[PDB]
Design an enzyme around this catalytic site. Structure first.
Site, PDB file in Angstrom:
ATOM      1  N   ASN A   1       2.832  -6.707 -21.727  1.00 55.43           N
ATOM      2  CA  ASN A   1       2.657  -5.611 -20.775  1.00 55.43           C
ATOM      3  C   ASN A   1       2.004  -4.392 -21.423  1.00 55.43           C
ATOM      4  OD1 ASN A   1       3.885  -7.142 -18.708  1.00 55.43           O
ATOM      5  ND2 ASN A   1       5.914  -6.292 -19.138  1.00 55.43           N
TER       6      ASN A   1
ATOM      7  N   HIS B   1       9.496 -17.727 -28.334  1.00 54.90           N
ATOM      8  CA  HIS B   1      10.843 -18.189 -27.974  1.00 54.90           C
ATOM      9  C   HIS B   1      11.602 -18.690 -29.178  1.00 54.90           C
ATOM     10  CE1 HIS B   1      10.188 -18.626 -23.327  1.00 54.90           C
ATOM     11  NE2 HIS B   1       9.722 -17.459 -23.803  1.00 54.90           N
TER      12      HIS B   1
ATOM     13  N   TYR C   1       1.409 -16.334 -24.998  1.00 55.28           N
ATOM     14  CA  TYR C   1       1.428 -14.913 -25.366  1.00 55.28           C
ATOM     15  C   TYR C   1       0.063 -14.423 -25.850  1.00 55.28           C
ATOM     16  CZ  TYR C   1       3.136 -10.522 -27.493  1.00 55.28           C
ATOM     17  OH  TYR C   1       3.342  -9.198 -27.837  1.00 55.28           O
TER      18      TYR C   1
END
EC number: 4.2.2.-
Length: 632
Positions: free
Chosen positions: A164, A219, A227
Site C-alpha cells: 500500500n 508469509h 508482493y
C-alpha cells in the site's frame, strides 16, 4: 522548477513502459463517456468496485492520450474528457475527508480512494501538462491529495505500510513537487523514510523478504512473488526520485531472472495459491538473458533458452512446500512435482480447477488425481515437508536438480527426483517413489509424462490417435510444441507410456507404477521432453550401484546424480553440489564422479574453492553452494 519539468518529461517518456509493468490496470480502454458516472454502465458513487473501474479506465485513457501510435494520441476531445472526469470525481469527494471510513460504500472499502485514486490525479495532471488544463489539474491534485494523502503513508485516518505504502509514495511525492518542495526535502520526510526502508529489499537469511539467493519469500516461509509483482512498477519512480542507492536493484533483477520469462511464463511453485503459470506483467519487468539460473538455498533451478522456459522448484525443510486457503487446496502436486518445459512459441495455456492437478512430472495417487491439503485455519496455512534436501548444479547451457522429499500431508509421498535441463530438452527420473503402506485401496499410482487441456484446440491429434498412428506407441507424442519420450535405464524399472483421461477436461500420457512398489518406496519412472523439431540422443545409465545415475545428453553435456551429490560437466567446466549443503567436497567424491561418467583420469583446478583438508572448501558460501572446477 527544473526538477518538476524533468520529472514530468521522464514520466511521459516512460508511461507506456511503466504501464506495461503495472499489475492492476485497464489496458487500451474504449468505454463510452458519461457526464454523470464518468463512464457508461458503471455505478461508481454507490459501488466502490465500480469507482475502482472508473479510476483504472481514466488511467488507461491517459496512456492512450500519451501514446504516439494510438489513434487518440494528443486528441483534444480526450483531453477534455480526462479533465472533465477529474472534475466529476472532485465534486463527489467529501471535504473534510472521512476519518477511518470510506467516503461512500462499505466503511472498509478504502482501497480505491487511497491507492488507485491518487494515481488518477497524477496520470491526468502529467499527461495533460502541455494543454490548457494543466494548471487546473495541478491545483486539484495539490488540494485533494493534500486532504486524502496528507503524508506518504497516511490516508483517511489510517497509517499504511508495505505494498500500500509503495503505491501511495509515488503520487504523494509528485504532489509535493507540485507544491514546490525539492526532492531532497521530500526525501527527509518521516513518511518517505518509512517507504525507503520498505523498498530497500536487503538480502535476508530467513522470514519475509529477498532471500540471499534472490528468491522472494512471503508469509514467513512461502516462495511467493505476488508482493514483488504488485508493486514492481513503482520501483522505477523511487529510483528516479531518490537515486540508484535506495533499492537493491541487483537482488531484485536476479530474483526476476530466477523465475520469470519474457513471455510471462513462471513456474507455478512461486506463484499464487490458485495455481498459475502466467503473469501478464513479469515479462516486462526486465530484459531477460538466455541463461541457466539457480537459487541454491531456496531451491529453484530455471533455464531460459532460445526455444524454451523450464523450471523446477525443489524442496527444503526450511521452506513451505505448499500453502492453501479456504478456496484453494488442490495445488500441492503442481507446486512440488511440476517437471515441464514450455515452448516459448507455444500457446500459454493456464490451469483451471479441472486441470490444475495435472502436469508433466506430477505423481498421481488416484485415477481422478485430486489431492487436497485443506487450510486448518480460517485463512491461509503453509506446510513444511517431512524431508526436504535438494542439490543443484549448473553450467553454461545445462542445469541439474536433485530432490529428496517426503510430504506427510500427501499420504507420506516420498521420492528421489533427478531433473536435467539442456538444449533442447529435459530429462526426468523419479526413483524410490513411496507412499504410506496399504493406503491406496489397490489403485496403481502414475507419473504424468504429458498432459493436455482438451478444451484447447491445437493442430495436434489426440494422444490416443497419435499413439495408434505411431504403430500403437506413445513415443514421440506431441502437445503444444513439446514432444515426450520414455527413457529406459538398464536395471531400473521404467514403465511404458500409456494414454488415459482422468476427467472430461484432461488427456494424459503417463507411466503407471504399481501400488506394491509404492508401498516399498521402490517405484520408478523416467521420461524426457524435447522442444518440437529438436531431437537428441540422450542416454542414461545406472552405473554399478544404487542411485548412481549417469546421463550423457550426447551433445557435450554430462550429468551425474549420486545422492547426496549432483554434478554437471560441460566443455571445460564442472559444477558439484551436495543436497546436505556441505561447504566442503572430498577429493574422493570428485574422483568417483569422474570415474562414473567415464572420465577417470580427468585433471582439474578449483575455480571458486580451495584445498582444505582432504578436499576443497567453498571460497564463499553466503549466496551459492556449488563447487566449480575447470578441466585443465
Amino acid at each position: 522548477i527544473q526538477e518538476l519539468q524533468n520529472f514530468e518529461r521522464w514520466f511521459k517518456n516512460n508511461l507506456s513502459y511503466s504501464f506495461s509493468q503495472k499489475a492492476e490496470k485497464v489496458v487500451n480502454p474504449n468505454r463510452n463517456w458519461n457526464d454523470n458516472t464518468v463512464f457508461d454502465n458503471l455505478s461508481p458513487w454507490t459501488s466502490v468496485p465500480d469507482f475502482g473501474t472508473v479510476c483504472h479506465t481514466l488511467i488507461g485513457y491517459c496512456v492512450r492520450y500519451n501514446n504516439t501510435s494510438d489513434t487518440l494520441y494528443q486528441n483534444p476531445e480526450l483531453a477534455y474528457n480526462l479533465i472533465n472526469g477529474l472534475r466529476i470525481i472532485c465534486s463527489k469527494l467529501p471535504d473534510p475527508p472521512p476519518h477511518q471510513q470510506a467516503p461512500w460504500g462499505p466503511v472498509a472499502d478504502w482501497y480505491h480512494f487511497t491507492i488507485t485514486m491518487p494515481e488518477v490525479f497524477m496520470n491526468i495532471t502529467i499527461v495533460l501538462n502541455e494543454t490548457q488544463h494543466y494548471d487546473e489539474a495541478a491545483s486539484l491534485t495539490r488540494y485533494w491529495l493534500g486532504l486524502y494523502l496528507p503524508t506518504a503513508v497516511n490516508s483517511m485516518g489510517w497509517h499504511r505500510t508495505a505494498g500500500n505504502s509503495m503505491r501511495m509514495g509515488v503520487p504523494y511525492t509528485y504532489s509535493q513537487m507540485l507544491r514546490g518542495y525539492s526532492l531532497a526535502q521530500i526525501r527527509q520526510e518521516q513518511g518517505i523514510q518509512e517507504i525507503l526502508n520498505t523498498i530497500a529489499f536487503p538480502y535476508v537469511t530467513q522470514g519475509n523478504g529477498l532471500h540471499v539467493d534472490s528468491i522472494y519469500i512471503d508469509h514467513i516461509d512461502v516462495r511467493a512473488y505476488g508482493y514483488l509483482i504488485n508493486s514492481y512498477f513503482t520501483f522505477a519512480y523511487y529510483t528516479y526520485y531518490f537515486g540508484d542507492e535506495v533499492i537493491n536493484t541487483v537482488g531484485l533483477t536476479r530474483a526476476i531472472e530466477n523465475v520469470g520469462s519474457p513471455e510471462g511464463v513462471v513456474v507455478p511453485g512461486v506463484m499464487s495459491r490458485n495455481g498459475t503459470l502466467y503473469s501478464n506483467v513479469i515479462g516486462n519487468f526486465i530484459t531477460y538473458p538466455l541463461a541457466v539460473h539457480s537459487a541454491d538455498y531456496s531451491k529453484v533451478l530455471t533455464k531460459l533458452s532460445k526455444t524454451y522456459y523450464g523450471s523446477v522448484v525443489g524442496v527444503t525443510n526450511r521452506l513451505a512446500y505448499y500453502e492453501s486457503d479456504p478456496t484453494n487446496n488442490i495445488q500441492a502436486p503442481l507446486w512440488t512435482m511440476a517437471r515441464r518445459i514450455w515452448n516459448r512459441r507455444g500457446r500459454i495455456i493456464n490451469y483451471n480447477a479441472n486441470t490444475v492437478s495435472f502436469e508433466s512430472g506430477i505423481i498421481l495417487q488416484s485415477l481422478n488425481g485430486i489431492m487436497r491439503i485443506p487450510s486448518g485455519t480460517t485463512s491461509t496455512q503453509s506446510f513444511r515437508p517431512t524431508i526436504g534436501q535438494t542439490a543443484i548444479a549448473k553450467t553454461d547451457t545445462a542445469g541439474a536438480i536433485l530432490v529428496y522429499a517426503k510430504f506427510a500431508e500427501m499420504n507420506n509421498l516420498q521420492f528421489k527426483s533427478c531433473t536435467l535441463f539442456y538444449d533442447h530438452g529435459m530429462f526426468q527420473l523419479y526413483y524410490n517413489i513411496g507412499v504410506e503402506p496399504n493406503s491406496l485401496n489397490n489403485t496403481n499410482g502414475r507419473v504424468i509424462v504429458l498432459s493436455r487441456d482438451t478444451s484447447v484446440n491445437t493442430n495436434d491429434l489426440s494422444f490416443e490417435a497419435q499413439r495408434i498412428n505411431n504403430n500403437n506407441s506413445s513415443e514421440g507424442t506431441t502437445f503444444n510444441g513439446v514432444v515426450c519420450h520414455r527413457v529406459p535405464i538398464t536395471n531400473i524399472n521404467v514403465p511404458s507410456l500409456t494414454v488415459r483421461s482422468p476427467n472430461s477436461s484432461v488427456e494424459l500420457v503417463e507411466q503407471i507404477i504399481s501400488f506394491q512398489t509404492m508401498y516399498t518406496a521402490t517405484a520408478s519412472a523416467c521420461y524426457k521432453l524435447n522442444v518440437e523439431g529438436h531431437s537428441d540422443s540422450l542416454r542414461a545409465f545406472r552405473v554399478n550401484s544404487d542411485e548412481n545415475i549417469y546421463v550423457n545428453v550426447g551433445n557435450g553435456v554430462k550429468a551425474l546424480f549420486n545422492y547426496p551429490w549432483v554434478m554437471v560437466k560441460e566443455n571445460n567446466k564442472v559444477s558439484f553440489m551436495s543436497a546436505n549443503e556441505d561447504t566442503t567436497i572430498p577429493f574422493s567424491v570428485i574422483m568417483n564422479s569422474f570415474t562414473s561418467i567415464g572420465e577417470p583420469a580427468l585433471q582439474y583446478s578449483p575455480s571458486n574453492c580451495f584445498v582444505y583438508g582432504n578436499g576443497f572448501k567453498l571460497n564463499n558460501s553466503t549466496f551459492d553452494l556449488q563447487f566449480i572446477f575447470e578441466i585443465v
